Write a protein that binds this DNA or RNA. Structure first.
Ligand SMILES: [Mg+2]
Ligand SMILES: [Mg+2]
Ligand SMILES: [Mg+2]
Ligand SMILES: [Mg+2]
Ligand SMILES: [Mg+2]
Ligand SMILES: [Mg+2]
Ligand SMILES: [Mg+2]
Ligand SMILES: [Mg+2]
Ligand SMILES: [Mg+2]
Lengths: 218, 129, 88
RNA sequence: GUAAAGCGCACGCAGGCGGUUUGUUAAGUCAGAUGUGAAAUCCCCGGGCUCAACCUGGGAACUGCAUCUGAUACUGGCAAGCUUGAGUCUCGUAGAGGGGGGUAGAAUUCCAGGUGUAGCGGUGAAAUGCGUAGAGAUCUGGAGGAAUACCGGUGGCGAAGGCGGCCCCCUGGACGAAGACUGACGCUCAGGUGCGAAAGCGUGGGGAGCAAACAGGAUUAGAUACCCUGGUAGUCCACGCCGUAAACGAUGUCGACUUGGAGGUUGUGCCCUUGAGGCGUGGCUUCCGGAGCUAACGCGUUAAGUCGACCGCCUGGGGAGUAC
């Protein structure tokens, strides 16, 4: 009868034989995600985030999906942490070494407009250079504050942010993902069987995450 | 099966494990349950029961410690057309001793150690590691 | 195949009881008929092999049953082989 | 599966293997013991030649055969059973399954006759060929043989090979369902028996179209070919023979397990059966694909995954599936 009454079900018969012990029971085309098997996951995962947040760690919310991009920062950026609401680059968790390099020209690029150092070169030039910000500040603008690999990664849909999760389990960075019927939870060490979609499902839990994390460090 | 009812038992158990199944079911038999009783005490299986006073059907419960399962090795040896009978001084020792080896003795079904501790031999049944 | 007025007929002649369509004494005898009757059929056509395959089936299948009787009640064997004029 | 290797397919004798229960037996088997297993080698422990080699005491072993006394779980034998394997009966269902005999319509070719007239046919062009003895075209009548458009499908049936018009006659198998019956009567199968595309063979029929051979024309350096104009065996029928194929899923038969998705075809139960329809539950079958398997490709509940029973087969290439 609580807020957990918005992500009842999703993803039709495409499903995934693996995601079964979490299915309330198929009905009306698509199946349902047994919330009673979700209640423990509802906190068990959050508990660790709350616990790790106290260790002053790091948390990267991955949600390249449109219906989650613009609406993810308020839970990560505002809550001051880490997130990637766009095309997850190839290696921003493994080949970080060379990736961070991109972050630099992004930061120093920012300072350009900062002071009068922006009125340098032809008016056209500034434009050609400002475009880099659009891309940079987007694909990295919300990870720049990461001076080293995180300690735990919380990704929205376990399908879309596929590559994202991959690199993770290769570096030893725990992953808290809210999978789904057609999702492959075998890559998530902290499954949260919920509607990978639903404009409301995303917001509620997403914001709910930063909640525990916010005061996680007391 | 219709020719090797004992060999089937092992297969059904190992096939279940792989599929991370919970419990395996199949037709019962004096020797079958007898064998199923050993693996019980050996901690290889949770529990086991049967149904039918005329149509018996064995019921075993798979087991697993962590991410992987427990019974990660179960094969036969003394099969038809190639049966095996060892003495009290030939009995095998699965996995240097860790794994068990079911063997029918004149006293009943036992394990590599069991029968040995007794000082008698019997027809080997299978290796469980 | 065979006519009901015949199949359901013979069954009531070899069955040690009633409607015992299972009894070897019955089934077995029931086979000889469809066999002997077909011999007149195969006398004609000949080239019709796909039908003989089934013929041979019931033949061997019949024998598989005769061997059984001998291994379950010696008497019943020799007691039935006559009523069917078998062995030839 | 593709590296060498699944017999072209069935049935089946011998052989190997054998669902479940109780009693019984004690053959296999297991335990103990008694013989015997020559000595010497080997091995362990220990002795003597200054050491070693060597020599040497005792034991260990000689894995075997027999006999006796037991033990009875499993295998085997005997007795009485049991029903899920296998089979019988009933009633339905679908099918290009087979053998025989009919019959229909379209088209080709040919024969005859009418109309009509200088082209037709063919090719990349051409030419051979057919045409004024009148073709081709067209229309009417007749003869004959082969094959059955559409339906036809990623379809169906069959052991395999294979099997398409409609009708009848004789006949085999598969499957479902309430059930009733028998009671392990089963699985596999060297040798054996039988079935086998096409081509080919014998005797006798038949012969429209097609077409090895053969003959012309063309191409070309040549063209014993591809192309063109003809055309014989043959292809068709009966009956007998030959047994081969890339006889291919290049994957033996039987049985039990092991995530899923979409579809095809056929049976059955059920649902306001109010419907095209919706929910199950069996058979056979396509495509994708997970675990796993794999050298990779890929296979993936119809497995090439996990297992069990029986059979066939392979052991570098050439020489050679050849010689004898
Ligand atoms: Mg080859
Ligand atoms: Mg080969
Ligand atoms: Mg074959
Ligand atoms: Mg000696
Ligand atoms: Mg016995
Ligand atoms: Mg078939
Ligand atoms: Mg021929
Ligand atoms: Mg001829
Ligand atoms: Mg596949």
């Amino acid at each position: 009868m609580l807020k957990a009454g918005v992500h009842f079900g999703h993803q039709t018969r495409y499903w995934n034989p693996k995601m079964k012990p979490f299915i309330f029971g198929a009905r009306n085309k698509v199946h349902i995600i047994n919330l009673e098997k979700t209640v423990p996951m509802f906190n068990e995962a959050l508990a660790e985030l709350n616990k790790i947040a106290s260790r002053k760690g790091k948390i990267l919310f991955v949600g390249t999906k449109r219906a989650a991009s613009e609406a993810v920062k308020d839970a990560a950026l505002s809550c001051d942490q880490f997130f990637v609401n766009h095309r997850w680059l190839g290696g921003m968790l493994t080949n970080w070494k060379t990736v961070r390099q991109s972050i630099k020209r992004l930061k120093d690029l920012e300072t350009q407009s900062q002071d009068g150092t922006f009125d340098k070169l032809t008016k056209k030039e500034a434009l050609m250079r400002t475009r880099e910000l659009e891309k940079l500040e987007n694909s990295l603008g919300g990870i720049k504050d990461m001076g080293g690999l995180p300690d735990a990664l919380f990704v929205i849909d376990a399908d879309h942010e596929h590559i994202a999760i991959k690199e993770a389990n290769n570096l030893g960075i725990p992953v808290f993902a809210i999978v789904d019927t057609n999702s492959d939870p075998d890559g998530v060490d902290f499954v949260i069987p919920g509607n990978d979609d639903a404009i409301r499902a995303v917001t509620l839990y997403l914001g709910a995450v930063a909640a525990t994390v916010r005061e996680g460090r007391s | 099966s219709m020719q090797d009812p004992i060999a089937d038992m092992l297969t059904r158990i190992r096939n279940g494990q792989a599929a991370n199944k919970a419990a395996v079911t199949m037709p019962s038999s004096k020797l079958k349950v007898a064998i199923a009783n050993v693996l019980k005490e050996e901690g290889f299986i949770e529990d086991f029961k049967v149904e039918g006073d005329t149509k018996p059907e064995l019921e075993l419960t798979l087991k697993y410690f962590q991410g992987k399962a427990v019974v990660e090795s179960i094969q036969r040896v003394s099969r038809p057309g190639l049966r095996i009978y060892k003495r009290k001084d030939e009995l095998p020792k699965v996995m240097a001793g860790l794994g068990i080896a079911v063997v029918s003795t004149s006293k009943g079904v036992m394990t590599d150690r069991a029968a040995r501790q007794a000082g008698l031999g019997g027809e080997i049944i299978c290796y469980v590691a | 195949s065979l006519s009901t007025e015949a199949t359901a007929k013979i069954v009531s002649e070899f069955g040690r009881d009633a409607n015992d369509t299972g009894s070897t004494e019955v089934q077995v005898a029931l086979l000889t008929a469809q066999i002997n009757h077909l011999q007149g059929h195969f006398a004609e056509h000949k080239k019709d092999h796909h039908s003989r395959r089934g013929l041979l089936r019931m033949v061997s299948q019949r024998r598989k049953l005769l061997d059984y009787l001998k291994r379950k009640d010696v008497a019943r064997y020799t007691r039935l082989i006559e009523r069917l004029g078998l062995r030839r």
